[PDB]
Structure formats: C-alpha cells, structure tokens
C-alpha cells in the first residue's frame, strides 16, 4: 500500500452527550468563578469571615 | 430547598463556629448561596427573589450552629436604599435574631426604625413581624422586661405613632402580645 495508496484521515471526534454536558458545565462554572473573583478583587468587598 | 436540608450542627463545649470546623455538607451549601448572592449583585433577578432566598438561607444557617450569630449582614441589607423585599427579609432575620439571642441593642434598633423610617409600609411590617415573632411573651421572664421598655412602648402607643392609624394599632397589638391586657407585671 505505501507505494501508491492514500486515504485522508481525520481527528477523533468527541460526540458524547455526557462529556459535552460536563465540558460546557465546567467551562461555565470556571468562567463565572473567574469573573466574580476578578470583580470582587477590583472593588469594594465584603466577607463572611474576619479578613477573608 | 438548600435551606430546608440544614439540620442542627453538633457543637462540642460551645465551640466557636469558625471556618475550619464547618460541616462538610454545609460548606457546599454556603458556597452555593455565596455564589448566588454575589451573582445577584451583578445580574439581579426580577424582585431580588434570590436575595430574599439567600438571606433567608443565611438566617437558617445561623439558626443552627453553622454560621456565627451576627446580625450585621442583615442590618446592612435593611438600610433605606434597598428594595423593599430585601428590606423586609432582612428585618425578619433581625427580628428572629433578637428573639433567639435576647439582644437589647437590636430591639432598640428595631424600635428606632419603627419611629423614624421613610417608608411607612416598612414600619407597619416591622411592628407586624415583631408581633408575630415576639422577643418575649407575657409568660416569659426575660432580661428585656424593664420599666424602660414598658415606658418606651407606652410612649409609642400614646405619642410617636399619632400620624398613621396603622402604626398605632400595631403598637397596641405589640403591647398586648408583650405585656397583656393587665398592668405590665415587670414593673414597680
């Protein structure tokens, strides 16, 4: 085959509903955590605990 | 639903409730209500329904031995510039605190807020909540049964609430709930 046979090949597609739900959930949780920590650090802040 | 799951914590020797000796269940609940309240501060709801639910849940966690029994958060949410649903939820939490912790200064805070608040609906609601969940009844011996409190509430019935006709009936209801139909007993 190597002498004259060519087939294109693609990357492995992840079409799984479980891991797609997990990816979208974890990315949404991480971006909202990053956003809220950035907005609490660059403004006036409160704390449930002393100096937290 | 997160607030309904909270069972009373197993404090040992009245151990101070700090962050390290928190329940492993309640840390997840506390993280979720912190996330919800902070996200309400940036993307608000329709009538701050999540603020009301999170203040109610923080009062649930304080009623059991999980969060320190401190009314300063609810006292900051009960200021004038907030929405009225947040205000009445925070004042309900302060009324529950001054019933459970027998706080004198919180009762004086609530009576001062009855006397001079801009919104009269909030004054009527504070008298209503302090009638429904009274700091003491007539049967109880409490530290808050002075002649000073009897004189304050009699002055609030007599003068002070003379301009509303609904604050005066609420003060009559509060005096009836606290001291009854006869002479206040805790008096010379």
From Swiss-Prot, chain A:
Subcellular location: Nucleus; Cytoplasm
Regulation: induction: Induced with triglyceride accumulation.
Disease note: Neurodevelopmental disorder with severe motor impairment, absent language, cerebral hypomyelination, and brain atrophy: An autosomal recessive disorder with onset soon after birth or in early infancy. Affected individuals do not show developmental progress, are unable to sit or walk, do not acquire speech, have poor visual fixation, and show poor overall growth associated with feeding problems. Additional variable features include seizures, spasticity, and joint contractures. Brain imaging shows hypomyelination, thin corpus callosum, and cerebral and cerebellar atrophy.
Domain notes: Ectopic expression of the histone fold domain acts as a dominant-negative mutant resulting in differentiation inhibition.
Protein task: The TFIID basal transcription factor complex plays a major role in the initiation of RNA polymerase II (Pol II)-dependent transcription. TFIID recognizes and binds promoters with or without a TATA box via its subunit TBP, a TATA-box-binding protein, and promotes assembly of the pre-initiation complex (PIC). The TFIID complex consists of TBP and TBP-associated factors (TAFs), including TAF1, TAF2, TAF3, TAF4, TAF5, TAF6, TAF7, TAF8, TAF9, TAF10, TAF11, TAF12 and TAF13. The TFIID complex structure can be divided into 3 modules TFIID-A, TFIID-B, and TFIID-C.
Further comment: 'Taube nuss' means 'empty nut' in German.
The protein's assembly and partners: Component of the TFIID basal transcription factor complex, composed of TATA-box-binding protein TBP, and a number of TBP-associated factors (TAFs), including TAF1, TAF2, TAF3, TAF4, TAF5, TAF6, TAF7, TAF8, TAF9, TAF10, TAF11, TAF12 and TAF13. Interacts with TBP, TAF1, TAF6, TAF10, TAF11 and TAF13. Component also of a small TAF complex (SMAT) containing TAF8, TAF10 and SUPT7L. Forms a heterodimer with TAF10. Interaction with TAF10 is mediated mainly via its histone fold domain while interaction with SUPT7L is via its C-terminal region.
Family, similarity comment: Belongs to the TAF8 family.
Listed name of the protein: Transcription initiation factor TFIID subunit 8
Organism field: Homo sapiens
Swiss-Prot record, chain B:
Free-text tissue specificity from the UniProt record: Expressed in all tissues tested.
Coiled coil: none
Subcellular location: Nucleus
Additional remark text: PubMed:9418870 was unable to show an association between TAF2 and TFIID.
Disease involvement: Neurodevelopmental disorder with feeding difficulties, thin corpus callosum, and foot deformity: An autosomal recessive disorder characterized by impaired intellectual development, microcephaly, delayed psychomotor development, pyramidal signs, thin corpus callosum, and foot deformity.
Family label: Belongs to the TAF2 family.
Quaternary structure annotation from Swiss-Prot or TrEMBL: Component of the TFIID basal transcription factor complex, composed of TATA-box-binding protein TBP, and a number of TBP-associated factors (TAFs), including TAF1, TAF2, TAF3, TAF4, TAF5, TAF6, TAF7, TAF8, TAF9, TAF10, TAF11, TAF12 and TAF13. Interacts with TAF2C1. Component of the TFTC-HAT complex.
Functional description taken from the UniProt entry: The TFIID basal transcription factor complex plays a major role in the initiation of RNA polymerase II (Pol II)-dependent transcription. TFIID recognizes and binds promoters with or without a TATA box via its subunit TBP, a TATA-box-binding protein, and promotes assembly of the pre-initiation complex (PIC). The TFIID complex consists of TBP and TBP-associated factors (TAFs), including TAF1, TAF2, TAF3, TAF4, TAF5, TAF6, TAF7, TAF8, TAF9, TAF10, TAF11, TAF12 and TAF13. TAF2 forms a promoter DNA binding subcomplex of TFIID, together with TAF7 and TAF1.
The protein's name in its UniProt record: Transcription initiation factor TFIID subunit 2
Organism, as annotated: Homo sapiens
This protein's encoding gene: TAF2
């Amino acid at each position: 085959p190597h002498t004259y046979i060519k087939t294109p090949t693609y990357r492995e597609p992840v079409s799984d509903y479980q891991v797609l739900r997990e990816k979208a959930a974890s990315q949404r949780r991480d971006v909202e955590r990053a956003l809220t920590r950035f907005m609490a650090k660059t403004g006036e802040t409160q704390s449930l605990f002393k100096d937290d | 639903a997160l607030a309904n799951s909270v069972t009373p914590a197993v404090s040992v020797n009245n151990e101070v409730r700090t962050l390290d000796n928190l329940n492993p269940d309640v840390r997840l609940i506390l993280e979720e209500i912190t996330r919800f309240l902070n996200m309400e501060k940036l993307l608000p709801s329709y009538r701050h329904t999540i603020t009301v639910s999170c203040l109610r849940a923080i009062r649930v966690l304080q009623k059991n031995g999980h969060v320190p029994s401190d009314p300063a958060l609810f006292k900051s949410y009960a200021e004038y510039g907030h929405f009225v649903d947040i205000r009445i939820a925070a004042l309900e939490a302060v009324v529950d605190y001054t019933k459970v912790d027998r706080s004198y200064e919180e009762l004086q805070w609530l009576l001062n807020m009855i006397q001079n608040d801009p919104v009269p609906y909030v004054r009527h609601k504070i008298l209503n909540m302090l009638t429904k969940n009274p700091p003491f009844t007539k049967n109880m011996e409490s530290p808050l049964c002075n002649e000073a409190l009897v004189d304050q509430l009699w002055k609030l019935m007599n003068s002070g609430t003379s301009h509303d006709w609904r604050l005066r009936c609420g003060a009559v209801d509060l005096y009836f709930t606290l001291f009854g139909l006869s002479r206040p007993s805790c008096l010379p």
